[PDB]
Symmetry: C2
Subunit: 408 residues, 2 copies
């Protein structure tokens, strides 16, 4: 997937947007753009509204102003996106017809959603035993283990939807850039995986601080707090709020505090093992290919639909892979997640990816592992033998907040 990032950053046409006008700067030194047309599209949350094709006639190192038409102004809520592509209509010695050689995407005007939610008349019912909180609404049912503090099981009818509870995750299976030249004989103490292991991020245990459940006028409110401690030192504190309303949606808000002296965590997010194995993953976000916070310039915001095997990148040395950033909606089987998050979705846990040396030794686990991150560290790659993640992609803010909506 890094080859697409190289293609986009090395593209021979540069684009600048100013209002309705696109200027196209050629970076060719010698040739005129005689096998190029600019295709543009305007879409509102993935669905297309307007499009067009303009032939490019730009000199070497020249410019060409492309006046767009009067773009549509929908009063529907959502972000409006402009995407341009440079398409080569004719085959060359090295490319097929219809080869895309350059692209760029921009945000146009946004309409914020001021619509109130539809006030349903049903109310979720809270049942409190000493083992769990049980919330039922129609055929749906949610169970929160009161000793662990996590949502342990969800039901649709009588089908259990989870194999592993929805828990906070602060680690990733380490990349080659995270490892560096460190091995078991020679520890490189500056490498990110050795700082994470010495700080105990991979073996910090969650301790439930408090758990409350309350019935509102239209919702059930579950509030939890956990601490991640390693040898008496609290690494992370996560405070969550679960709000199940009458429409069946579960709004999760997560507030995480990170100790400033621990090394910065690789991610801040949630994981669970779903019981479903669906065949296709549908999401509204950056894609289609995997992308990371410091490797997302080549990805485009659109509605993407891939099989589940395309959501896993088979690196020969297994690691964290398949992340999609900038995601506003994720569809997998019956489930739908909304917010602004990063996700990856695969048949392999982060624990299995960490402990397996070759990709052919990976076995697909039961169900589907979902990681949903509010925040994810950059991957680096200036070199692979010193820490190369720049400071603006490290998770160094100390306090983090993100929101999710789980629904069906």
């Amino acid at each position: 997937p890094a080859l697409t990032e190289a293609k986009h950053q090395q593209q021979f046409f540069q684009f600048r947007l100013s209002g309705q006008t696109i200027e196209v700067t050629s970076e060719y030194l010698f040739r005129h753009s005689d096998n190029e047309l600019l295709h543009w599209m305007v879409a509102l949350d993935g669905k297309p509204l307007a499009s067009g094709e303009v032939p490019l006639d730009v000199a070497p190192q020249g410019k060409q102003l492309i006046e767009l038409p009067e773009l549509p102004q929908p009063e529907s809520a959502g972000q409006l996106w402009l995407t341009v592509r440079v398409v080569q209509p004719n085959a060359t010695a090295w490319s097929e017809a219809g080869h895309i050689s350059a692209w760029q995407q921009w945000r146009l005007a946004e309409n914020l959603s001021v619509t109130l939610p539809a006030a349903s008349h049903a109310i979720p019912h809270l049942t409190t035993s000493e083992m769990d909180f049980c919330i039922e609404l129609g055929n749906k049912r949610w169970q929160f283990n009161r000793q662990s503090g996590f949502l342990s099981q969800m039901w649709i009818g009588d089908k259990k939807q989870l194999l592993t509870p929805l828990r906070d995750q602060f680690t990733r299976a380490p990349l080659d850039n995270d490892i560096g030249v460190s091995e078991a004989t020679r520890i490189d103490p500056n490498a990110w995986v050795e700082r994470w292991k010495a700080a105990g991020h991979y073996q910090a245990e969650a301790a439930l601080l408090q758990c409350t459940a309350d019935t509102l006028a239209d919702a059930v409110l579950i509030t939890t707090a956990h601490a991640w401690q390693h040898q008496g030192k609290t690494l992370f504190i996560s405070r969550k709020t679960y709000r199940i309303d009458g429409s069946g949606q579960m709004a999760i808000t997560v507030d995480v505090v990170v100790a400033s002296d621990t090394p910065h965590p690789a991610r801040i997010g949630l994981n669970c093992q779903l019981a479903q194995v669906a065949e296709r993953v549908n999401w509204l976000g950056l894609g289609p290919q995997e992308n990371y916070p410091d490797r997302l310039t080549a990805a485009c915001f659109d509605r993407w639909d891939l099989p589940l095997s395309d959501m896993y990148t088979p690196y020969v040395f297994p690691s964290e892979n398949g992340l999609r950033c900038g995601t506003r909606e994720l569809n997998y089987g019956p489930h739908q997640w909304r917010g602004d998050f990063q996700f990856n979705i695969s048949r392999y846990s982060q624990q299995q990816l960490m402990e397996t040396s070759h990709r052919h030794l990976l076995h697909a686990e039961e169900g589907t592992w979902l990681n949903i991150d509010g925040f994810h560290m950059g991957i680096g790659g200036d070199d692979s033998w010193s820490p190369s993640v720049s400071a603006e992609f490290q998770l160094s803010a100390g306090r983090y907040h993100y929101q999710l909506v789980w629904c069906q």
Copy 2:
């Protein structure tokens, strides 16, 4: 102008929960949406959590925060944060984190052309009279409203208003100053993230 979208109030097992939502609209275009949560517990503390969504096509806001005019006029301001002098997100390297205590007149910088001034960043606790605010915020505190500072051309024409104007910001734009005749606030100090969250605790 703010338009109330919804307002709910609920009694919990140990607290009262007030939840509001406002929209700021100008000529049919929604600029900002703020969703708040007020939690008054049995200890008298009021925990405020604010979630703000900013439209991506509007220019980025100068600040995201709260204001009120307190009725108290106390003589000294006490805070745990960066100081003693006023500092901004792109001008805070000289400030030190400590417990600072100044008179209220030192919390106002008398620029001859009046403007926003007196901000203290990185503040974890603010004490003024009987009140105490906690969180991680920026504040300024003065006798002059932001409206008066905007409409007054000289500092000698400023009159102290009744009470004390408090601004508490979760987020504040940088001030710039590469030059003063073109936009000079760099992109890492503009409020461009689109979604913002901050938390306060008001107590006595």
